[PDB]
Amino acid sequence: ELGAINLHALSMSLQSKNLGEINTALNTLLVTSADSNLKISLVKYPELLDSLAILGMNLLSNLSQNVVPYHRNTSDYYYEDAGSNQYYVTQHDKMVDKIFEKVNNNVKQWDLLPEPIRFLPNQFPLKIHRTPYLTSLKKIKDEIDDPFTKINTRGAEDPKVLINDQLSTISMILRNISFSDNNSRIMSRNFYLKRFISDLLWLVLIHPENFTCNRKILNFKKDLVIVLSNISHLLEIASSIDCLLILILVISFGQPKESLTFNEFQLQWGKYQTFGVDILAKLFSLEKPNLNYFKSILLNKNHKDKKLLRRLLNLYNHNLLNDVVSFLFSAIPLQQVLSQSADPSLLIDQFSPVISQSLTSILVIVQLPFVWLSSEENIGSGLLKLSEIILNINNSYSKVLLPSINISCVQLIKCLVEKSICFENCLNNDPEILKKIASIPNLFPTDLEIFQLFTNPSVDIQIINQYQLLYNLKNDILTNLE
Amino acid sequence: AELIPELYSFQQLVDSEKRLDHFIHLRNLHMKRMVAQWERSKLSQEFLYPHLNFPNVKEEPFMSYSPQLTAIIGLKSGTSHDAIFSIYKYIHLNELLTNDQVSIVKLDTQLITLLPSSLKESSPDTMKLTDLLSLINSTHLLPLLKFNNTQRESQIGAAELNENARELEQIKPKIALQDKEITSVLSNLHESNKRYRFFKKISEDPVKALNECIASTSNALKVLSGDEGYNEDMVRRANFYKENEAMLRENIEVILS
Amino acid sequence: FLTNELIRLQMEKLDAKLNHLKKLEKFMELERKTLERQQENLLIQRLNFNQNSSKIVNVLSKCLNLISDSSQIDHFKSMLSKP
Amino acid sequence: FLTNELIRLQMEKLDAKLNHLKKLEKFMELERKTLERQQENLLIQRLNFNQNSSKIVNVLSKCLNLISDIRSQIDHFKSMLSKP
């Protein structure tokens, strides 16, 4: 609303008392919500973010430890005195006191600021919470009215819900802060913020029950993936755990039911399943020898951290990243190719290309004991018909069309050849594969289409080469089949 | 959203046929993808049909070729389209093309003999094949019942595709009605579920269930109206001997008060 | 509860049945027509290549005579480079 | 027990519907694959034979060039015979 001017509320937030925390947190949340003219600039801000992450870490911690803060019987919790000193004592003379002490009767370590993040003793990894968007109805069922709602829609008559909603509000305001330049202020350097993200993840998914309303869990997942969307730079300090966490977070969406495990999403409900692949591209483009490499180790099937990692993979039971493939294969098809026109496509088309980009990128990362193939009466590939659509569009938004179709073709050829050569190297399957490969209606654009293409547009040279080499591999497969 | 088609998450799954009708719905989605791609498949199969002109074996369109042409393809008549696709593949195989436009192709007597009168011999070029297409579309295509057959071609599959689309649309609204019924019975299921949960919880130990439902009803009454923090604690002893944040909050107060 | 579920089953049955009818009719039609087109294409190109090969053999006889007075495409080109 | 009758019947109908479904499914699929394989077969057949036609054309062109010291086929053949 109004009033509500200053920024320095951070001070009060930094303070460790329930009162100040409420007073600020609620206000500043309402603030960052308002945007008509209300934005949080950056001058000497950062202190805000620090304070925030510190607060969240401590609260979530002692929550996991199941102990209420803000109220004990200790206070001003260290030394209090006015002893024998003016300014400089505790030299040699101090031992005299010992002497004194021996005749009158007739060093420390200090912890760092935040607490540890993982290895927490009570918190030991047991598989829970790998459930899909379905829980919304759970949420409904939870939020459903019933003689036992236990939704204290009012304030904290008990501190548990207090901590819950506290963290909730913190998450929300954190989201709202994250919609501008000053993403650079958030850019992977608020080591505090990253610690917060990490441990929050490690809880929300490995969540021994302390969260009241599942809807709170949804909120957390949701604004979390959003604020991720507004990151386009490094992550994954103490990576591996965090990398797997983020993967499970994005996998949260899409309906499950070898073959593809994911019914493609009927695009009229959700918009987060978007954010998922959005991040899995953006925050994954960095070919720096860390992130890509973490997921590469995730191909496999302090030091205790490593124990954790495999500890979850077998606690997700073969391979798993096929699930990531299937997930990536959602939201593209079966609606635009089933519409009445190609214009309403362009909207979600804008969204589409990053997906194929992510896919082909991960296919640079698959070149060892597996069984993988993903064209088995599961998708076919309307990619060809889609390419034709965008082509006809070309000769009849923008700036994304040509790259989309190009990378679609590249995707096709690369996945084909990689499948073939992989099951060649293993050679655990009959040459029927070729015949199998030769048995796709969604494949190998007809040579007549190639020909007529070779004439009209004349504005697609690179694409012409794409189709050219594609058809080349096609004819090769035909020949060497016999 | 997800609520609208289904709610099946867990219901105690008593007489768990819910997995089975689940599978039924799953296979419905299967059939959905099936029919979708089938429509697309029929489209694709059609695609070639308007563009083919090979059928000769069972006005008359096969126009004869030139001596140059019968020297080129060894075929005497037919359509220009077939000949031009042939020479297209000819350029492809001989690879006389150039790729810096690409339609510039290095001319050869195998070709230039198609137009030797204009003194193209003065310049064997690497020129636009389109120029040749323009050249050989009437320059060497010249001359020197089965009307029913024009019927049995591309139009067939198109028409049957239209029929299939029409009958699918015919059946659609019945499906819509069934979906309405689905939603209805689902909501009824849902309410009945709530009731059963309530009732069995009463079966458990009616004392606690009664107390809790009563208090919740009261709380609902209040929240649906103005709200007050504490219904009680006129019994001072409890909430004050067993609580001390009172002290600190007070302290904060008196400073201002 | 079980009553309502049985009703759901009835609905699913209706759905599946109508879909089955669609499947049978439409797809048998499509596959029939495609098979016909395919076989037409097959036999027509068969006889096409037959006419071709015959012509080629005739040309072979001719060029054989001509060279002598100066598949088998192998021996043809062999004698060709030989001359 | 009429209930149990109904239940078993529901189960059996479920099984039968599933089986019919999957059978017809795979059946369509294999038919499609057959048609496809054979289609591409025909395609490459046509390709190779047009290639052969063009090939022998280039061959006989070379031969005509040698003579230095279908209609056009028999034409050049008769011309060579006359030269001989």
PDB file of N, CA, C and O in Angstrom, chain C residues 16-39:
ATOM      1  N   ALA C  16     -14.119 -46.105 -25.333  1.00  0.00           N
ATOM      2  CA  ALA C  16     -13.323 -47.090 -26.044  1.00  0.00           C
ATOM      3  C   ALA C  16     -14.073 -47.650 -27.238  1.00  0.00           C
ATOM      4  O   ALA C  16     -13.504 -47.789 -28.320  1.00  0.00           O
ATOM      5  N   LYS C  17     -15.354 -47.971 -27.061  1.00  0.00           N
ATOM      6  CA  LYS C  17     -16.113 -48.601 -28.134  1.00  0.00           C
ATOM      7  C   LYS C  17     -16.185 -47.698 -29.355  1.00  0.00           C
ATOM      8  O   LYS C  17     -15.912 -48.128 -30.488  1.00  0.00           O
ATOM      9  N   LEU C  18     -16.582 -46.444 -29.144  1.00  0.00           N
ATOM     10  CA  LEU C  18     -16.670 -45.530 -30.276  1.00  0.00           C
ATOM     11  C   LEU C  18     -15.316 -45.387 -30.951  1.00  0.00           C
ATOM     12  O   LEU C  18     -15.214 -45.390 -32.190  1.00  0.00           O
ATOM     13  N   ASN C  19     -14.262 -45.285 -30.147  1.00  0.00           N
ATOM     14  CA  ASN C  19     -12.931 -45.200 -30.721  1.00  0.00           C
ATOM     15  C   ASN C  19     -12.623 -46.427 -31.561  1.00  0.00           C
ATOM     16  O   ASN C  19     -12.022 -46.315 -32.631  1.00  0.00           O
ATOM     17  N   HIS C  20     -13.025 -47.607 -31.088  1.00  0.00           N
ATOM     18  CA  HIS C  20     -12.778 -48.832 -31.841  1.00  0.00           C
ATOM     19  C   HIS C  20     -13.431 -48.768 -33.204  1.00  0.00           C
ATOM     20  O   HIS C  20     -12.833 -49.168 -34.213  1.00  0.00           O
ATOM     21  N   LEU C  21     -14.681 -48.323 -33.243  1.00  0.00           N
ATOM     22  CA  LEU C  21     -15.369 -48.222 -34.523  1.00  0.00           C
ATOM     23  C   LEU C  21     -14.604 -47.304 -35.462  1.00  0.00           C
ATOM     24  O   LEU C  21     -14.358 -47.643 -36.633  1.00  0.00           O
ATOM     25  N   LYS C  22     -14.220 -46.131 -34.955  1.00  0.00           N
ATOM     26  CA  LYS C  22     -13.402 -45.212 -35.737  1.00  0.00           C
ATOM     27  C   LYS C  22     -12.178 -45.921 -36.290  1.00  0.00           C
ATOM     28  O   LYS C  22     -11.897 -45.882 -37.496  1.00  0.00           O
ATOM     29  N   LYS C  23     -11.435 -46.578 -35.401  1.00  0.00           N
ATOM     30  CA  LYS C  23     -10.212 -47.256 -35.793  1.00  0.00           C
ATOM     31  C   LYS C  23     -10.469 -48.194 -36.953  1.00  0.00           C
ATOM     32  O   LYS C  23      -9.914 -48.033 -38.045  1.00  0.00           O
ATOM     33  N   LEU C  24     -11.329 -49.183 -36.714  1.00  0.00           N
ATOM     34  CA  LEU C  24     -11.618 -50.186 -37.725  1.00  0.00           C
ATOM     35  C   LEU C  24     -11.896 -49.527 -39.063  1.00  0.00           C
ATOM     36  O   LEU C  24     -11.118 -49.668 -40.016  1.00  0.00           O
ATOM     37  N   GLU C  25     -12.965 -48.732 -39.123  1.00  0.00           N
ATOM     38  CA  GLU C  25     -13.400 -48.205 -40.411  1.00  0.00           C
ATOM     39  C   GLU C  25     -12.296 -47.393 -41.071  1.00  0.00           C
ATOM     40  O   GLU C  25     -11.776 -47.764 -42.141  1.00  0.00           O
ATOM     41  N   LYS C  26     -11.920 -46.279 -40.436  1.00  0.00           N
ATOM     42  CA  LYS C  26     -10.967 -45.368 -41.049  1.00  0.00           C
ATOM     43  C   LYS C  26      -9.726 -46.110 -41.500  1.00  0.00           C
ATOM     44  O   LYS C  26      -9.359 -46.083 -42.681  1.00  0.00           O
ATOM     45  N   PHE C  27      -9.092 -46.820 -40.577  1.00  0.00           N
ATOM     46  CA  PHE C  27      -7.747 -47.275 -40.845  1.00  0.00           C
ATOM     47  C   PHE C  27      -7.728 -48.437 -41.815  1.00  0.00           C
ATOM     48  O   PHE C  27      -6.811 -48.521 -42.640  1.00  0.00           O
ATOM     49  N   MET C  28      -8.724 -49.327 -41.769  1.00  0.00           N
ATOM     50  CA  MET C  28      -8.789 -50.328 -42.820  1.00  0.00           C
ATOM     51  C   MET C  28      -8.903 -49.659 -44.183  1.00  0.00           C
ATOM     52  O   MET C  28      -8.226 -50.065 -45.139  1.00  0.00           O
ATOM     53  N   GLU C  29      -9.700 -48.587 -44.281  1.00  0.00           N
ATOM     54  CA  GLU C  29      -9.813 -47.889 -45.557  1.00  0.00           C
ATOM     55  C   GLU C  29      -8.457 -47.361 -46.015  1.00  0.00           C
ATOM     56  O   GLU C  29      -8.032 -47.586 -47.163  1.00  0.00           O
ATOM     57  N   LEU C  30      -7.778 -46.636 -45.128  1.00  0.00           N
ATOM     58  CA  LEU C  30      -6.509 -46.015 -45.493  1.00  0.00           C
ATOM     59  C   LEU C  30      -5.493 -47.056 -45.922  1.00  0.00           C
ATOM     60  O   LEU C  30      -4.797 -46.885 -46.932  1.00  0.00           O
ATOM     61  N   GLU C  31      -5.393 -48.144 -45.170  1.00  0.00           N
ATOM     62  CA  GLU C  31      -4.382 -49.135 -45.494  1.00  0.00           C
ATOM     63  C   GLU C  31      -4.700 -49.825 -46.811  1.00  0.00           C
ATOM     64  O   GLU C  31      -3.793 -50.086 -47.611  1.00  0.00           O
ATOM     65  N   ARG C  32      -5.977 -50.102 -47.071  1.00  0.00           N
ATOM     66  CA  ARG C  32      -6.342 -50.682 -48.357  1.00  0.00           C
ATOM     67  C   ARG C  32      -5.891 -49.790 -49.503  1.00  0.00           C
ATOM     68  O   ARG C  32      -5.189 -50.240 -50.422  1.00  0.00           O
ATOM     69  N   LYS C  33      -6.293 -48.518 -49.467  1.00  0.00           N
ATOM     70  CA  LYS C  33      -5.980 -47.638 -50.588  1.00  0.00           C
ATOM     71  C   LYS C  33      -4.477 -47.492 -50.765  1.00  0.00           C
ATOM     72  O   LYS C  33      -3.969 -47.502 -51.896  1.00  0.00           O
ATOM     73  N   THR C  34      -3.746 -47.374 -49.659  1.00  0.00           N
ATOM     74  CA  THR C  34      -2.302 -47.246 -49.761  1.00  0.00           C
ATOM     75  C   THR C  34      -1.691 -48.485 -50.387  1.00  0.00           C
ATOM     76  O   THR C  34      -0.807 -48.382 -51.243  1.00  0.00           O
ATOM     77  N   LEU C  35      -2.136 -49.665 -49.960  1.00  0.00           N
ATOM     78  CA  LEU C  35      -1.633 -50.900 -50.545  1.00  0.00           C
ATOM     79  C   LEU C  35      -1.847 -50.907 -52.049  1.00  0.00           C
ATOM     80  O   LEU C  35      -0.953 -51.290 -52.817  1.00  0.00           O
ATOM     81  N   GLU C  36      -3.034 -50.491 -52.484  1.00  0.00           N
ATOM     82  CA  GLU C  36      -3.315 -50.451 -53.914  1.00  0.00           C
ATOM     83  C   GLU C  36      -2.332 -49.542 -54.636  1.00  0.00           C
ATOM     84  O   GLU C  36      -1.730 -49.929 -55.649  1.00  0.00           O
ATOM     85  N   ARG C  37      -2.181 -48.317 -54.137  1.00  0.00           N
ATOM     86  CA  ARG C  37      -1.253 -47.376 -54.753  1.00  0.00           C
ATOM     87  C   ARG C  37       0.140 -47.972 -54.841  1.00  0.00           C
ATOM     88  O   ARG C  37       0.822 -47.870 -55.870  1.00  0.00           O
ATOM     89  N   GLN C  38       0.580 -48.592 -53.748  1.00  0.00           N
ATOM     90  CA  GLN C  38       1.911 -49.166 -53.702  1.00  0.00           C
ATOM     91  C   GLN C  38       2.087 -50.201 -54.794  1.00  0.00           C
ATOM     92  O   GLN C  38       3.071 -50.169 -55.539  1.00  0.00           O
ATOM     93  N   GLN C  39       1.142 -51.133 -54.904  1.00  0.00           N
ATOM     94  CA  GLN C  39       1.304 -52.204 -55.881  1.00  0.00           C
ATOM     95  C   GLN C  39       1.281 -51.660 -57.303  1.00  0.00           C
ATOM     96  O   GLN C  39       2.025 -52.140 -58.175  1.00  0.00           O
TER      97      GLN C  39
END
